[PDB]
Design a protein around this ligand. Sequence first.
Ligand SMILES: Nc1ncnc2c1ncn2[C@@H]1O[C@H](COP(=O)(O)OP(=O)(O)OP(=O)(O)O)[C@@H](O)[C@H]1O
Ligand SMILES: Nc1ncnc2c1ncn2[C@@H]1O[C@H](COP(=O)(O)OP(=O)(O)OP(=O)(O)O)[C@@H](O)[C@H]1O
Ligand SMILES: Nc1ncnc2c1ncn2[C@@H]1O[C@H](COP(=O)(O)OP(=O)(O)OP(=O)(O)O)[C@@H](O)[C@H]1O
Ligand SMILES: Nc1ncnc2c1ncn2[C@@H]1O[C@H](COP(=O)(O)OP(=O)(O)OP(=O)(O)O)[C@@H](O)[C@H]1O
Lengths: 244, 100, 523, 519, 512
Amino acid sequence: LSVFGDRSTGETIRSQNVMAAASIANIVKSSLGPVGLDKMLVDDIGDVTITNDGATILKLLEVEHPAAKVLCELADLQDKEVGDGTTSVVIIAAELLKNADELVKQKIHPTSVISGYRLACKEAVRYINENLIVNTDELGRDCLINAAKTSMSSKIIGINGDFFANMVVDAVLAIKYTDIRGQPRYPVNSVNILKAHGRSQMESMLISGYALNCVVGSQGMPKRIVNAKIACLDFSLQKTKMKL
Amino acid sequence: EQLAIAEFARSLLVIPNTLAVNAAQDSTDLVAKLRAFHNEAQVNPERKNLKWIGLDLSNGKPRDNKQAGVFEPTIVKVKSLKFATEAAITILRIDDLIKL
Amino acid sequence: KAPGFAQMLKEGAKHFSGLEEAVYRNIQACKELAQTTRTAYGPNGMNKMVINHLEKLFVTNDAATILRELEVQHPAAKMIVMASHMQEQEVGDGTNFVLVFAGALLELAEELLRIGLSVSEVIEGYEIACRKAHEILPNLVCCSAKNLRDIDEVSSLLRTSIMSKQYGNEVFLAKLIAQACVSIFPDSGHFNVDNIRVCKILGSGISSSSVLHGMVFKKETEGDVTSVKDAKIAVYSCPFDGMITETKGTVLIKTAEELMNFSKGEENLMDAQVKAIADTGANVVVTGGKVADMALHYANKYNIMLVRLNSKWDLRRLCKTVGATALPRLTPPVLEEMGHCDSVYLSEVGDTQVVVFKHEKEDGAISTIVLRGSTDNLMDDIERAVDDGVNTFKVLTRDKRLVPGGGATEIELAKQITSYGETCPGLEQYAIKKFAEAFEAIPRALAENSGVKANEVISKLYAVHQEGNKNVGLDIEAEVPAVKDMLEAGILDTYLGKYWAIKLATNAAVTVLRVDQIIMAKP
Amino acid sequence: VILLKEGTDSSQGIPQLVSNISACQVIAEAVRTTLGPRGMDKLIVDGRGKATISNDGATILKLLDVVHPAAKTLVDIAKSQDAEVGDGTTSVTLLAAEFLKQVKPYVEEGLHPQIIIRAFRTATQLAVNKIKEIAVTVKKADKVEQRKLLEKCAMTALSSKLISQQKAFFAKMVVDAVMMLDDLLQLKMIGIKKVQGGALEDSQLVAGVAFKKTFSYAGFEMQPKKYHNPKIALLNVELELKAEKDNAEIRVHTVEDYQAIVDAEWNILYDKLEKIHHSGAKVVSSKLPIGDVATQYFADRDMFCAGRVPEEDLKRTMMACGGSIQTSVNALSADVLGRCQVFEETQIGGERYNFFTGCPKAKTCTFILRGGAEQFMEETERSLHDAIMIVRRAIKNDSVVAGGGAIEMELSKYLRDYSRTIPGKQQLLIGAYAKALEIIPRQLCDNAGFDATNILNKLRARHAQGGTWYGVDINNEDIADNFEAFVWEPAMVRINALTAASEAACLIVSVDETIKNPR
Amino acid sequence: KRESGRKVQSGNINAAKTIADIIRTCLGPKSMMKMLLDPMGGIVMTNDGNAILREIQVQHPAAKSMIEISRTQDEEVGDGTTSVIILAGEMLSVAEHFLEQQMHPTVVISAYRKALDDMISTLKKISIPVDISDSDMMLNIINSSITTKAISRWSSLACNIALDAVKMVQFEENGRKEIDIKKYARVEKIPGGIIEDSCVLRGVMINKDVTHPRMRRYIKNPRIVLLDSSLEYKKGESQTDIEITREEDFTRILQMEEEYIQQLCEDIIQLKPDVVITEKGISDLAQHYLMRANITAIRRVRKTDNNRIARACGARIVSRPEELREDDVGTGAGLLEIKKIGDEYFTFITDCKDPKACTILLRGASKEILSEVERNLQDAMQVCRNVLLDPQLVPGGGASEMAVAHALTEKSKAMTGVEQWPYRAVAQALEVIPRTLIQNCGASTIRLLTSLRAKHTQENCETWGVNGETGTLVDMKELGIWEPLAVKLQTYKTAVETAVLLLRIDDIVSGH
Ligand SMILES: Nc1ncnc2c1ncn2[C@@H]1O[C@H](COP(=O)(O)OP(=O)(O)OP(=O)(O)O)[C@@H](O)[C@H]1O
Ligand SMILES: Nc1ncnc2c1ncn2[C@@H]1O[C@H](COP(=O)(O)OP(=O)(O)OP(=O)(O)O)[C@@H](O)[C@H]1O
Ligand SMILES: Nc1ncnc2c1ncn2[C@@H]1O[C@H](COP(=O)(O)OP(=O)(O)OP(=O)(O)O)[C@@H](O)[C@H]1O
Ligand SMILES: Nc1ncnc2c1ncn2[C@@H]1O[C@H](COP(=O)(O)OP(=O)(O)OP(=O)(O)O)[C@@H](O)[C@H]1O
């Protein structure tokens, strides 16, 4: 035969596709979780970037192989859908291919594997949705205060965990606003965290309002006002110019 | 299709398997402690069965996620199982290689 | 040619230079010997696939069987094997204790030589820490034996020797040895290991075994004599057959009339040889070879008890018991080569006829443990457990002192030695600190064989010993990495067995580290 | 130049166990396809050049003789299987290597082998108690006689065979053959002989000992066959006139002794014939052939003689008559003579056959086969030997379990459910122990040529609904209740096969280093 | 291609151990020299650890990360870069707890970061306050770097240069006491003169020469003006180019060039200035209308140097030349001077106060002597900066290393868990700093280090250090081998921050 390349078929292209796909899972195996290990991303110039986030790992990982190129596009379908989850798809799907590769050696055609996987996936959503929890228990019942206390344990703030967890629980419930038909979500903007020297870390106060880090200057003008009108302007009341 | 779904259940066990090896614990004990508590929720509906048992990677001991407050959204869990099986379907449908 | 061989000037022997680290090759020689027996320590240890030189297969985990079959050729590693045979003397335990602790001694000594310490200074710190280890060992003695010579005291203390020799027989082998040593225990200072002889019959299993007094052979009595109290025992290794002279003795047969004359003449000479034992008063004849059918008729004619023993190892046991010497000639009527026994009789145990050799006017110290088994490979492993079980209690005729085991006397010895090494000034504090870390490898070898991470067990043992909770050892569980109390579980080893084990393993580190060059010499 | 090994073959660690696990599978591959009644046979030739055709697992492993150390550990388990129960060497050889196959990826990930030892001792101890609970005692169930039940199990075992059409006749003969024996049942007592020619309906069952009788010498028209109480003599002496062993050659030069020389050579034959006449032996059986002159001797003395008897049939005659085999003739007396009630020379199959009936120690039988080929009768002999084996184990052991992988798929379901309730390292090992027990219904589908995945997926679905005695069928290409179809096996052989396969798998796992002595 | 598993955990260890073994013997005053072989046959025998690794190319990604973390540490403080790479190579050198014990690195990082908190707590216990007001105590700190140099003949005057420079940059009103030597203390080199001629002036110096005598020579009240726009031909919003090849194009361009510049120069001379400072360049025709008013032309100044001029006089930064006003005045400045120094002209806008900026003027007999003082004073300025940042010293010369390693041994007796075994390895890895000091002196290392630990146990831990001159142990309270605290604080912090970065790497993959 005289063709324009090399041809290869059979089960040897099945074993080569799962070994190229599971090798990408080993790139995102140790980086899974909050205690995930850093991995070096060697560039073609010579510099290296130390990243441990698995979303930035697969973006910079360049493997010139079509089996590994399939797993590159699912990172683009993950952030555009929800925004999180990315490497948990990779370790699941590569172990799905490795167990199915053992089925090919056990005289099973992959057509029963494909139709069996779609019924196993739809029944997985059915068992999940029968064991859910509605978004509630915001006040009075803790799975929250204790929820944010685990994230706060890695720093020096975790010595007094009950004092600082109350500052973030009431701040999350304060920024709630529906604004479309009863959605309620939470905005990307949040509370402004300022700092001062109050002789210890126990003098933090939960102020129910925005705090500006500016000084008014003169003292003869009174600092306590009752009127409601607030003026904001960007043009300078100083000596103006046409252009810089 | 019994072996297709039975290997689908064992392939989902790599998520506590990689989490146990990153928590510096014995992966044969920490994953098996998760399935020992989740099996009792299906055998009998008595309240002595531990339900919604999460994985505390800090102390190396399984705890309840309702008390610890470890929660995840449903759309990150549903779309992960939806996208991973469709990606495993496309690679499994490859039976011939052509290069030019 | 140029350049010449540096420092190799004696019979072409490979003399490594200072950069080639000639003293480090002896450390790697004892490292490979210790690694074959590191995973074999403990009840969770692995078996060894033994292929003997006579092409016989064996599956066993004894420490003495590994050293005898794996023919070591390195003489630097032969210093520990010659020390392990010294461990076989005066005590029957600690053969793995010599190979592991001295192997961990030289492995930790290689880290000291990499800093630049001299070999003459490190070896002086080991003999200092050995004398300090001999002071805390009486202080680590928790309890002692009761010395009441009963079954319950012997069987409760024998559970340490049955551990790691034959697992699963902890309830059976603790009672079989206990019924044998209590017959010699009234004889104070006369308990000997060669008094307890082991015999093995192919049978069902371990639970069908029993204990008998005196010398018991598995072969039945060939004659019809059931019981006779004759003292004269004449052992003959020759088979009972026709007489062949030491002279020429040409017997000619031509026709069938000469066939019936010489066959009857051989039966008459066989009658004369049995009559040559009857006139001297010996009614006990043990035959080493085969017995003819006509010789069985002459046995019941003169009422002489004839037994046949084909094996040479059981025939040599009667030579050192009654004093009877096996004669190779066709029954020489002599009296000096005979034995002495009060009563010999035939009896059955488990539907198997055995011959008993006991003494009634003498006090009696001979005991025989009839062992039963389906496979001859596993039956030989229980046979070596008897020799390492009796020698565990052969040392208890001395001062009865017991130490706790399972790393209880290992971490507590490593704690007090480091306290002596921290306060000691001078450069000798480095060798004493590595003498204590060599004591940690033996609970590390016990935890790694049980499928448990070794660093988790060591930190759990150092947490309870810092609070003063003594006698805490390893809990034998692959799933539970915790610890348990050794006085409540019943693991108590010997103080004298731990005394010679640390002494011989330290001197093995003395002898190997003094050798830094190997030279072949021709006589 | 100073070495520690110097030719010593020794290695330890993890890959010494992986080299011992994969070396165990080469012995299982030698007897993988021989499982089942429709299994493939193996061709083994010895050093002399003789080809042996057999599918029995006990005969394959006895002629393999692999010099590997781990391969020798599967030999003595097959030897102990013959002493413990009697057969099942090909079942414990296949089951031992599949235990090591499922734990082979678990050893390479860093798990210690001693934890797998603690899991094999646990799940096998649960498998002993699980068998005795499901095992039902069928002795007088539904008020049916045991003779009718013994013909039902032999009908399924002889199905899909050459005699599958006439299996109603062959099922009634295998039951009465074991019923003719005493309480001490033995497969060696019932012998099978083959007679060439005729249809399958002419097969007969001899209550005593019958042999081939290849004696084709002279001796017709005399020596009457019917005897009331004959004295059965078992000899090994040649009674020919010019024999290869009994002769007399004297070299004299006188014509007077030349008559005496031929007379002395005849007196060797005549005195050996006169001692049988004094002992009163009516029938003369000898291993060596008997000449035409000695047949004329017993013709006038009212006796029978028949030589060329095999020594295997002579020992079966000794166990039937109760006498003893005597080689010489001067020791022939009534202590070694036998006795029977009916002896006759039959003409079944065109050839002459001798058989005794009515012995005082008649504990042996003989099965006569008829057919158009000897290889038709060779496979019929092994199938009827299999039909006797199922009947014999039903009489000895009443507590039976369902065969055909029904007890293997039920043990795979219980041990999987026990593993889900156990935390720790015992979950992934006992759960792999349950999947390793599924090789018996899987290799039964492979050797029968069926779809191995289409039956096993429907077999586990039948056990999930509540089917406790459903297995594979050798006739139909679907699942069936083996308890209703009378496919049985005793509970004691199923228990002893599990404790032997777990002990053979534990001896390989507990070995980590191989010691070899240079000699 | 790619590599993962435990091989990269051992591969990054030998990559950092190879860098640490090169400059291990270059520690102390007896630092051994190192010979570098060039492809052109050149040889440099510099013993400076920053100069050795700069001229050595590396190919390992872990070894490349080892050099840049010390290079950034050299930009922060000017001392202690060799001790970082030695300590970062010794902490990873005990691979028995990393590979043989089969320990995950997360146990090691939890033991290393917990040992980092004991580094800061121990150094504050062995510290000593500094009387910074006394000039005699400041001389005993900077003298450790002035020895064996050509500046050592003028140590009494060179110490006054660095001490007066750091105090003017440091602002006590801000509270945090910031010192930045690169901007507010820009050092310039002037040829000619001697070492004694070099002094410190309170202003900013301009190195632009004088090209015409029609300038301001001595002005008591300097009227300064700052401008950002250019002084050239008017360009459009496009990217067109200017090419003058025709005589018709030469007349039309130059007439537009003169009319726009004269319109620009009329707005600056109406305020009667003394010196003009433009951000961009000044053309040749722009000086023709500027020389008629006798104004000093200063051009080509950066935006960063422009704010130092505005804070010196108090002028206003004006964006366009048409928008000048009367508030752009430099009233309050001392004197304007264009006086030549060694046949080079320099502009002086100095004052008699502290206008948040300064400069350093160096003089010398030859240009090689100019490069010798500026590399010694900049090394001396960063050391004296750390003293005024926090007046606390530590006993150097290996005394602080044995005091820290003694506190970790008694702390490890109460630290239970699996992590106590790598916790004791940091105490033996911190002993490599007094270990190489005895090996460079030539004495027996283990004979002296064992008696060094015996003196740190029974006696006081603040004394009994190592002298790197004679080879024996001396008391650190008797000799001035005192190190700053902020240097030793960032040394142990970076050595942990290097060990937390190399041990956390578990995969090396490629990709652009
Ligand atoms: N609070 C928590 N407690 C225990 N485990 C957690 C917690 N939060 C997340 N995890 C585990 O960590 C894993 C997330 O890993 P990581 O954040 O490194 O990458 P990822 O988010 O899965 O990648 P991607 O962004 O594509 O989805 C999840 O599988 C989850 O099981
Ligand atoms: N089950 C157990 N519990 C506690 N300690 C044990 C156990 N098994 C073994 N050991 C420890 O192992 C050491 C002796 O073990 P082992 O029985 O392997 O030596 P040994 O085999 O008797 O020596 P030899 O080879 O001379 O017979 C002792 O220190 C003992 O404390
Ligand atoms: N008539 C039958 N129908 C269906 N299955 C059967 C039948 N007879 C035997 N089997 C199955 O075949 C398996 C054994 O096959 P085979 O007869 O080849 O080995 P075996 O000779 O019984 O082995 P062993 O001699 O060790 O007992 C058993 O597990 C049994 O369940
Ligand atoms: N005579 C001496 N004996 C022993 N140690 C000394 C002596 N003189 C100085 N030292 C110490 O040696 C240290 C210098 O060591 P080293 O050369 O490794 O660092 P360095 O190169 O000065 O650091 P950097 O590269 O940051 O300048 C000084 O901090 C000082 O405390």
